[PDB]
Amino acid sequence: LQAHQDIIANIGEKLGLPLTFDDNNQCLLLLDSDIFTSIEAKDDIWLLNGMIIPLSPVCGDSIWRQIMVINGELAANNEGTLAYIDAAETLLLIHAITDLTNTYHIISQLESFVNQQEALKNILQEYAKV
Amino acid sequence: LQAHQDIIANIGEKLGLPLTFDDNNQCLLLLDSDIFTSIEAKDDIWLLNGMIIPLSPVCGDSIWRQIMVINGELAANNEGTLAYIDAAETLLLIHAITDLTNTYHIISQLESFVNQQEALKNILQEYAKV
Amino acid sequence: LQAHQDIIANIGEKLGLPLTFDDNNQCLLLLDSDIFTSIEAKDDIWLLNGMIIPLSPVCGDSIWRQIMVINGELAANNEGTLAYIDAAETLLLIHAITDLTNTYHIISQLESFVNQQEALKNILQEYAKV
Amino acid sequence: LQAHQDIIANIGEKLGLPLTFDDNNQCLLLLDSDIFTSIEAKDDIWLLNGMIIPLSPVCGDSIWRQIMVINGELAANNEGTLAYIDAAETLLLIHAITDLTNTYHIISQLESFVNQQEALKNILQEYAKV
Amino acid sequence: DKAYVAPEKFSSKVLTWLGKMPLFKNTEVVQKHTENIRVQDQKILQTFLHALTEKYGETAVNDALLMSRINMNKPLTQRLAVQITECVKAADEGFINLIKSKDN
Amino acid sequence: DKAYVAPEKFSSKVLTWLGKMPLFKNTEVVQKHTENIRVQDQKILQTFLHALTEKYGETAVNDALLMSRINMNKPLTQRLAVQITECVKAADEGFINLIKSK
Numbered sequence: 001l002q003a004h005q006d007i008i009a010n011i012g013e014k015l016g017l018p019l020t021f022d023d024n025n026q027c028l029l030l031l032d033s034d035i036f037t038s039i040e041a042k043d044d045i046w047l048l049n050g051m052i053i054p055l056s057p058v059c060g061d062s063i064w065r066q067i068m069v070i071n072g073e074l075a076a077n078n079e080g081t082l083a084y085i086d087a088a089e090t091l092l093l094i095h096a097i098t099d100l101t102n103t104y105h106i107i108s109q110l111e112s113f114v115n116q117q118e119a120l121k122n123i124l125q126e127y128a129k130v
Numbered sequence: 131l132q133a134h135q136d137i138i139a140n141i142g143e144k145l146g147l148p149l150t151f152d153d154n155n156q157c158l159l160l161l162d163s164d165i166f167t168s169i170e171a172k173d174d175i176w177l178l179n180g181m182i183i184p185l186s187p188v189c190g191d192s193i194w195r196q197i198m199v200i201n202g203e204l205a206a207n208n209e210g211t212l213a214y215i216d217a218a219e220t221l222l223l224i225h226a227i228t229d230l231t232n233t234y235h236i237i238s239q240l241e242s243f244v245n246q247q248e249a250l251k252n253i254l255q256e257y258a259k260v
Numbered sequence: 261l262q263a264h265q266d267i268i269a270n271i272g273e274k275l276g277l278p279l280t281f282d283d284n285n286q287c288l289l290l291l292d293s294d295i296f297t298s299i300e301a302k303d304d305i306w307l308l309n310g311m312i313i314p315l316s317p318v319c320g321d322s323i324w325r326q327i328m329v330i331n332g333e334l335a336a337n338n339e340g341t342l343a344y345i346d347a348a349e350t351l352l353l354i355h356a357i358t359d360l361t362n363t364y365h366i367i368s369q370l371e372s373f374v375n376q377q378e379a380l381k382n383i384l385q386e387y388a389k390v
Numbered sequence: 391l392q393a394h395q396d397i398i399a400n401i402g403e404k405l406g407l408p409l410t411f412d413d414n415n416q417c418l419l420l421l422d423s424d425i426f427t428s429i430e431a432k433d434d435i436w437l438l439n440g441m442i443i444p445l446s447p448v449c450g451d452s453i454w455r456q457i458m459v460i461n462g463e464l465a466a467n468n469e470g471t472l473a474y475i476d477a478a479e480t481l482l483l484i485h486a487i488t489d490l491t492n493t494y495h496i497i498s499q500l501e502s503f504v505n506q507q508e509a510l511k512n513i514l515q516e517y518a519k520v
Numbered sequence: 521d522k523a524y525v526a527p528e529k530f531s532s533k534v535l536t537w538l539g540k541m542p543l544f545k546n547t548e549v550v551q552k553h554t555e556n557i558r559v560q561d562q563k564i565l566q567t568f569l570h571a572l573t574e575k576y577g578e579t580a581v582n583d584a585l586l587m588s589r590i591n592m593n594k595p596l597t598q599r600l601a602v603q604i605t606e607c608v609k610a611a612d613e614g615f616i617n618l619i620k621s622k623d624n
Numbered sequence: 625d626k627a628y629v630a631p632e633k634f635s636s637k638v639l640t641w642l643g644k645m646p647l648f649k650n651t652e653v654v655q656k657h658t659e660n661i662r663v664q665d666q667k668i669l670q671t672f673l674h675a676l677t678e679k680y681g682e683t684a685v686n687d688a689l690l691m692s693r694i695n696m697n698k699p700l701t702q703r704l705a706v707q708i709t710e711c712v713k714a715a716d717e718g719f720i721n722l723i724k725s726k
Contacts, residue, residue: 015639016630022644026676030627030640033664036672045208051672057195064194065187065214071201072213075224078175081211083202084195086683090675096208098228111635147705158619158708160606165703166615184614202679203687218621220614241700249695275535276526282540286572292533293560296568305468311568317455324454325447328474328481331461332726335471335484336437343462344455346579348571356468358488371531407601418605418723420710425599426719439726444718462575463584478725480718501596509591607711611720616711 001025004041010103011110031114035121039110046100048110050093050117052082053128057089063127067091070120079116091124093117131155134171140233141240165251167244176230178240180223180247182212183258187219193257197221200250209246221254223247261285264301270363271370291374295381299370306360308370310353310377312342313388317349323387327351330380339376349389353377391415394431400493401500425508429500436490438500440483440507442472443518447479453517457481460510469506481514483507523557538565544573627661648677 005020008027012019019039021027027039036051055063071082080095093116097109135151142149151157157169170177185193197212204210210225223246227239265281272279279299281287287299296311315323331342340355353376357369394411402409411417415431428439445453461472470485483506487499523539538557542549550569559565574580610616630639642661646653654677658670678684714720 015634016632017628017639017641019641020644023647024645024676026645028642028645030642030663031634031637033638034668035637036665036669038672038676040676042206047206049676051668051675054668054671058191061188061190061194064191064198065216068194068197068212068214069216071211072215072222072224075211075213075226076177078177078226078228081201081205082198083205084198085202085675085678086195086199087681088671088675088678090671092202092675094202094205096205098208114635114637145701145705147707149707152709158711160610160615160706160708161700161703163606163609163704163706164613166610166613166618166708181613181615181618184617203684203691206679215618215621217624218614218618220618220621222618237700244700244703245695245697248698249691252694253691272537275530276528277524277535277537278521279537280540283543284541284572286541288538288541288569290536290538290559291530294564295533296565298568298572302466307466309572311564311571314564314567318451320451321448321454324451324458325474325476327458328454328472329476331471332473332475332482332484335473335486338435338437338486338488341461341465341471342458343465344458345462345571345574346455346459348567348574350567350571352462352571354462354465356465358468374531374533405597405601407603409603410605412605416605416723417603418607418714418719420602420604420714420719421596421599423600424717426714426717426722428723441717441719441722460583463580463587466575475722475725478718478722480722480725482722497596504596504599505591505593508594509587512590513587602710604710604714606706606708607714608720608723610708610711611715611724615708616715616720619712620715 001041004046007100007103007106008039008041011106014103014107031118035114035117037114037117044098044100046097046106048080048093048095048097048113050080050095050113052091052093052117052120053124054089055084055091055127056129057084057086059127067124070123074116080113082120089129093120131171134176137230137233137236138169138171141236144233144237161244165244165248167240167247169240174228174230176227176236178210178223178225178227178243180210180225180243182221182223182247182250183254184219185214185221185257186259187214187216189257197254200253204246210243212250219259223250261301264306267360267363267366268299268301271367274363274367291377295374295377297374297377304358304360306357306366308340308353308355308357308373310340310355310373312351312353312377312380313384314349315344315351315384315387316389317344317346319387327384330383334376340373342380351384353380391431394436397490397493397496398429398431401496404493404497421504425504425511427504427507434488434490436487436496438470438483438485438487438503440470440503442481442483442507442510443514444479445474445481445517446519447474447476449517457514460513464506470503472510479519483510541569544569547573627663645673648673651677 008019021041025041029037038049040047074080080093083094138149151171155171159167166181168179201212210223213222225243268279281301285301289297298309300307340353343352398409411431417429419427426441430437457472464470470483485503524537526535626643628641646657
């Protein structure tokens with residue numbers, strides 16, 4: 001886990017924060033005032049987790065299909081996967097970073113991810129359950 | 131594209147077939163006469179597509195949610211993304227190969243994708259259209 | 261032609277009649293009361309010709325299509341070809357016999373031909389030209 | 391069946407490709423990029439099928455008659471039978487190969503069939519469905 | 521010689537050799553002979569003989585020659601050949617439908 | 625333990641590190657912490673935490689074992705492989721329709 005801690009400390013230096021992974025191997029972040037993201041250390045890779053919207057498990061064919069169609073566009077560009085977390089009734093965006101040898105690459109992946117997150121929230125926010 | 135052609139040619143030698151990318155930058159394959167898998171050279175990466183099953187656009191919440199919950203599992207180990215291709219009414223597994231520097235390593239990644247595709251087909255076979 | 265004449269003579273003894281080829285390289289036969297057949301010597305092969313029905317050159321789509329569909333069934337079993345002789349406005353069944361090395365074989369071909377002739381005449385007689 | 395497989399394998403050798411019959415005793419081919427041909431092992435013979443043109447079931451007397459007259463010409467030299475497949479609304483050429491004892495002789499028969507098929511497509515192309 | 525009737529049936533049918541027919545060229549000569557043959561339907565035999573005659577001659581011989589001109593006796597050994605037997609399975613599994621839809 | 629706001633923006637947005645989160649298993653400890661920290665959307669934020677926690681819950685773990693049970697890690701080098709090249713043409717040209725109908 002030390003190698004992971006050293007890499008995120010470096011990223012932290014670039015961003016201006018003393019970042020580190022917690023006991024959950026997670027690093028929770030907030031962009032602006034409503035974009036929740038987390039960097040997760042997992043074996044040989046890192047996973048970027050992005051909160052999209054709380055969503056009904058019975059939202060209906062029309063909404064599910066739209067989400068699954070968006071998954072095709074996201075996968076075509078390797079931007080991540082929209083996944084449903086059952087009990088939590090939450091739609092998340094998940095993307096693995098398989099190359100951790102370069103700080104610049106990791107930062108670029110993170111910026112593309114948070115921007116993708118914002119774009120998806122703008123499209124899907126109307127389906128969020130109150 | 132020539133470099134992409136050299137790489138896929140190397141793979142063909144390993145598998146015993148003269149493989150190549152066509153005019154659409156794709157290599158279409160039929161494995162064990164039942165599994166459809168395609169490889170597309172796209173800039174720096176290769177995009178793998180694997181058909182799972184033809185699926186009704188109104189298959190209902192239960193099936194859509196199950197697929198979306200599985201996306202969480204695939205994304206965790208970066209095995210790929212299940213997506214819906216609207217015009218084809220087909221469920222598709224997609225995964226990008228970002229490291230094309232080692233022939234046998236590429237083979238390993240292709241093998242895992244095909245095995246994952248075969249596994250998803252077995253699990254979701256019941257939901258296939260008539 | 262001498263060879264053809266010998267072969268046809270041998271068949272005649274088996275069948276009980278002085279068969280032979282005429283100046284037109286033909287050997288006309290009558291079966292029962294209304295089935296006209298002809299055995300024709302043509303180079304290295306023999307052609308069996310069978311009168312089916314006099315038919316209008318403008319019998320209409322439905323009848324032509326039915327005959328053409330039947331040609332599919334006949335050819336699948338190599339039983340012969342239904343052909344139209346223009347000026348004579350006649351529908352004929354034509355089948356070539358490529359193996360003339362055996363008398364038993366030729367006779368077998370001939371008996372199947374006349375039975376086929378009978379079956380077709382029964383199916384198409386209603387369309388026969390008044 | 392094993393004998394049929396051995397025969398078409400030999401044919402494949404002379405043509406430069408590994409030919410084989412599938413579970414339905416068929417081998418489908420595309421020649422020169424526009425000639426579709428099929429070989430079917432059936433008992434002691436091989437049935438050759440060659441698609442000519444998709445054809446309207448109500449193409450009219452003139453077209454049906456021209457085709458049926460051609461059937462007479464084809465039958466004279468045992469080149470095959472033009473037939474109509476109703477369910478497919480397609481015109482195809484059908485011919486049986488009864489002598490399967492000599493590899494190059496079979497190649498000769500396959501060659502004449504493909505050339506006849508090409509010649510017929512050229513003659514009837516103008517009648518193909520729009 | 522005269523037309524002869526065989527004593528034993530063939531394919532459960534009476535068999536008769538109608539005798540030699542005169543050269544088809546002499547239409548009237550053929551018609552003459554035919555009329556002297558006892559048959560349930562004279563016109564049918566006549567029409568059958570006309571048809572056998574027309575199978576060759578001019579119109580047929582000419583369409584045969586034209587066919588010979590159009591028929592390009594290309595060597596099969598030099599044609600491009602591709603085995604596409606598996607394309608049927610591809611269509612049934614919906615593979616072809618997927619490829620085509622992704623083109624739009 | 626506490627949230628730190630970065631002095632300079634990231635991707636044109638204000639970047640904030642919410643700090644280390646307590647072990648996810650202790651559900652009530654996590655909940656209590658989420659309230660004590662300076663975050664506006666306090667409700668969006670545990671929900672996200674609930675989601676991250678469940679990714680490796682019982683159901684997930686068990687589904688992974690089943691998948692690994694269903695997955696037949698067959699050698700790609702031993703599978704029958706054919707390159708598809710003229711199938712769309714054959715369909716468009718009507719040849720497949722013909723074979724299926726015969």
